[PDB]
């Protein structure tokens, strides 16, 4: 079992290391998204 | 059967509105009118013929 194909490279980015967040909705299936829902604001704390 | 509101996720009761029966949530104004037939079969196991033991 040799690496015949798919020798993909891996790069690293530090531009958004401190500005990248992951938001997941446990109650909203992936089929329906909030792209069409107009948002108003977002409160947050550092 | 059990259905949930996409808004908050609570259970949806069925109620008679002003035009047609509709699913509705008890904690938000979300509603959904019924257009076509909706069925939920359970297929109970029946009784079987049991035999003449002896």
């Amino acid at each position: 079992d040799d690496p015949v194909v798919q020798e993909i490279d891996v790069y690293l980015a530090k531009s958004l290391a401190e500005k990248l967040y992951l938001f997941q909705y446990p109650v909203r299936p992936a089929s329906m998204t909030y792209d069409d829902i107009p948002h108003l604001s977002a409160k947050i704390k550092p | 059967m059990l259905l949930f509101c996409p808004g908050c996720g609570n259970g949806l009761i069925v109620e008679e509105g002003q035009r047609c029966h509709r699913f509705a949530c008890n904690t938000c104004p979300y509603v959904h009118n019924i257009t076509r037939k909706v069925t939920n079969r359970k297929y109970p196991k029946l009784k079987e013929v049991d035999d003449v033991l002896g």
């Binding site: 040799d2 990248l20 069409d36 | 949930f4």
Partner: protein
């Protein structure tokens, strides 16, 4: 009735309760169909081990944890797909293995929350997350090596 706001069934994979009228994939075939069958980019969410096989470069130390926050940009490793469906990650002298994580069906939006100013910031929706990968050390190889 609006078509993009119908009632959702309990099964997130079969929410199509009313219509107008999935086999468990593998990482090798996943990447194959992501690159060969199509060319559109995809956002993945992989889980790396706690400590990477490296040393914090001039980070003031101790054999502490080495995460991506200490490594610099550029090529850090390669991704190999051997025969029989093996998917490995060569991150230096050692080689980890990549497997498919829990099949998430709920909405996962990868966004960038950049606080450019101390009073007003920008939230940038980068994309959607669909698949999850898990990278694990090949402990068998590390043990049979020495």
């Amino acid at each position: 009735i609006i078509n993009i706001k119908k009632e959702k069934r309990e099964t997130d994979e079969e929410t199509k309760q009313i219509l107008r009228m999935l086999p468990k994939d593998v990482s090798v075939a996943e990447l194959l169909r992501e690159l060969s069958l199509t060319k559109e980019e995809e956002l993945l969410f992989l889980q790396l081990p706690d400590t990477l096989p490296g040393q914090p470069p001039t980070q003031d130390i101790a054999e502490n944890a080495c995460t991506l926050a200490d490594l610099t940009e550029g090529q850090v490793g390669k991704l190999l797909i051997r025969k029989s469906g093996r998917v490995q990650l060569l991150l230096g002298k050692v080689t980890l293995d990549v497997t498919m994580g829990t099949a998430c069906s709920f909405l996962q939006e990868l966004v960038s929350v950049g606080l450019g100013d101390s009073r007003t910031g920008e939230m940038t929706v980068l994309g959607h997350v669909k698949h999850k990968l898990v990278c694990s050390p090949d402990f068998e190889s590390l043990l049979d090596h020495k």
